């Protein structure tokens, strides 16, 4: 997560913009604006994770400036996929802002054009893959991984939507089993599996059992990341309560609620009125969810640490500890 790692990664971004525009002009001019607004925002943890994965998997003699740059181009393809997913999500959730910026669809003379922009950005990453990877053995595996992860992410987004009806949350749907499945499909595949598997393919590591071993730990890391994120939304302005999100806090609240407290969740969860958010926050404090999170965090850390030490098939343990360090 160092400043020098960020600068190395950002140095590639102008080339990505040139590749997808310069390299019908009013569309290409506009698309340069789409890319610069939506793609290089946030901390770029997923793109940087792709570069770090490659650096810790590849043979030192192969870690040339050229090959490290290729890993960066792969990282930007992950950031292109994310940008597409978040443009769509912000449209679907009718959100006002993301990471301090207005949601792309809310910008002047965007509106419903954000729908095509979402698909355009997703489509663009396969142009980048063709330009830089078409001559390599990792080309087809990388293409198939992106298509597979995109499909799985759409399945996650749909499962998330099946926890809401007529603008209200369906609290009967808020089970730990459904929560775990939403996090796995909607977040963990594209956030954790995709960067590491891309690093492995670029380092010409194709053993399916290596990818399966990596997947097992990265799905556990992914679940912790999202539970910590859900916790910090309320206790870390967080809008999960107002939005009626199937968050870990809401799932555990319903597990620990008596009938009177279940009725409070029924009446007040996913309501825009200021009194509702405050009533839910008060209930979360009353149910001792911060204390419950602290216990979960310790147990999960020790289980994941143990599982990383057990990773077989000659994978570097240090890669998973560096990722797991960044989360915790």
Q: What residues form the annotated binding site?
A: 89, 93, 160, 229, 233, 240
Q: Which stretch binds a copy of itself (CB under 8 A): 22-30, 229-237, 250-258, 311-319?
A: 22-30
CA distance 39 to 81: 9
Residues 92-121 interacting with a copy of itself (rule: CB under 8 A): 92, 94, 109, 112-113, 115-120
Q: Does 15 bind Mg ion (CB under 5 A)?
A: no
- Which partner from the list ligand IPE, a copy of itself, Mg ion, none does 186 bind, CB cut-off 5 to 8 Å by kind? ligand IPE
140 binds a copy of itself (CB under 8 A): yes
**Cβ closer to Mg ion: 220 or 233?**
233
List the one residue from 18, 29, 33, 43 that touches ligand IPE (CB under 6 A): 43
Residue among 139 and 235 whose Cβ is closer to a copy of itself: 139
Strand partners, 97: 102
> Residue 44 in contact with residue 72, Cβ under 8 Å?
no
| CB 219 within 8 Å of CB 136 | no
Q: 3-class secondary structure for the chain?
A: CCHHHHHHHHCCHHHHHHHHCCCCHHHHHHHHHHHHHHCCCCCCHHHHHHHHHHHHHCCHHHCCHHHHHHHHHHHHHHHHHHHHHHHHHHHHHCCCEECCEECHHHCCCCCCHHHHHHHHHHHHHHHHHHHHHCCCCCHHHHHHHHHHHHHHHHHHHHHHHCCEECCEECHHHCCHHHHHHHHHHHHHHHHHHHHHHHHHHHCCCCCHHHHHHHHHHHHHHHHHHHHHHHHHHHHCCCCHHHHCCCCHHHHHHHHHCCHHHHHHHHHHCCCCCHHHHHHHHHHHHHCCHHHHHHHHHHHHHHHHHHHHHCCCCCCCHHHHHHHHHHHC
Which candidate, 325, 169, 178, places its Cα nearest to that of 245? Answer: 169
Of these, 6, 67, 127, 261, which contacts a copy of itself (CB under 8 A)? 127
Query: Could you say which residues in the range 167-206 bind ligand IPE, by CB under 6 A?
Result: 186-187, 191
Binding of a copy of itself at residue 155 (CB under 8 A)? yes
Decide if 187 contacts 222 (C-beta within 8 A).
yes
Options 93, 148, 204, 297; binder of ligand IPE; rule CB under 6 A: 93
Q: In terms of CB distance, is 144 or 273 closer to a copy of itself?
A: 144
The yes or no reply on residue 257 touching a copy of itself (CB under 8 A) is no
Q: Does 181 bind a copy of itself (CB under 8 A)?
A: yes
For residue 120, the minimal CB distance to ligand IPE (Å) is 12
Q: CA neighbours within 13 Å on the CB side: how many for 200?
A: 25
CB of 314 to a copy of itself, least distance (A): 27
**Stretch of residues binding Mg ion (CB under 5 A), selected from 122-130, 190-198, 221-229, 309-317:** 221-229
Query: Binding of a copy of itself at residue 126 (CB under 8 A)?
Result: yes
Q: Kindly tell me which residue out of 91, 203, 205, 253 binds a copy of itself, with binding defined by CB under 8 A.
A: 91
Which residues lie near a copy of itself (CB under 8 A)? Answer: 24, 26-28, 30-31, 84, 88, 91-92, 94, 109, 112-113, 115-120, 122-124, 126-127, 130, 134, 139-140, 143-144, 147-148, 150-152, 154-155, 157-159, 161-162, 164-166, 181, 185
Which residues lie near Mg ion (CB under 5 A)? Answer: 89, 93, 229, 233
Which residues lie near ligand IPE (CB under 6 A)? Answer: 42-43, 45, 82, 85-86, 89, 93, 95, 99, 153, 157, 186-187, 191, 229, 233
């Amino acid at each position: 997560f160092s400043k020098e790692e960020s600068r190395e990664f950002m140095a590639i971004f102008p080339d990505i913009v040139r590749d997808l525009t310069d390299a019908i002009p009013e569309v290409t001019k506009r698309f340069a604006k789409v890319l610069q607004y939506n793609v290089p925002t946030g901390k770029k943890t997923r793109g940087l994770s792709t570069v770090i994965a490659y650096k810790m998997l590849e043979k030192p003699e192969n870690l040339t400036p050229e090959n490290v740059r290729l890993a960066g181009i792969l990282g930007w393809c992950v950031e292109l996929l994310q940008a597409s997913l978040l443009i769509m999500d912000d449209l679907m959730d009718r959100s006002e802002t993301r990471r301090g910026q207005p949601c792309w669809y809310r910008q002047e003379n965007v509106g419903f054009l954000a729908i095509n922009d979402c698909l355009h950005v997703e489509s663009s990453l396969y142009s980048v893959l063709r330009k830089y990877f078409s001559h390599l053995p990792c080309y087809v595996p990388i293409i198939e991984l992106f298509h597979d992860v995109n499909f799985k992410t759409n399945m996650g987004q749909s499962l998330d939507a099946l926890c809401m009806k007529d603008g209200r949350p369906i609290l009967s749907q808020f089970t730990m089993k459904r929560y775990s499945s939403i996090v796995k499909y909607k977040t963990s595949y594209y956030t954790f599996q995709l960067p590491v598997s891309l690093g492995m393919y670029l380092a010409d590591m194709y053993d399916p059992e290596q990818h399966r071993q990596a997947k097992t730990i990265l799905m556990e890391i992914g679940e912790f990341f999202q539970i910590q994120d859900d916790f910090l939304d309320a206790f870390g302005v967080g809008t999960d309560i107002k939005e009626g999100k199937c968050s870990w806090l809401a799932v555990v609240a319903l597990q620990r609620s008596n009938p009177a407290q279940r009725q409070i969740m029924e009446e007040h969860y996913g309501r825009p009125e200021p009194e509702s958010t405050q009533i839910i926050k008060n209930l979360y404090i009353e149910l001792g969810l911060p204390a419950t999170f602290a216990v979960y965090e310790e147990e999960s850390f020790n289980i994941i640490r143990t599982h990383i030490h057990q990773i077989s098939k000659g994978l570097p343990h240090d890669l998973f500890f560096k990722i797991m360090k960044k989360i915790y």
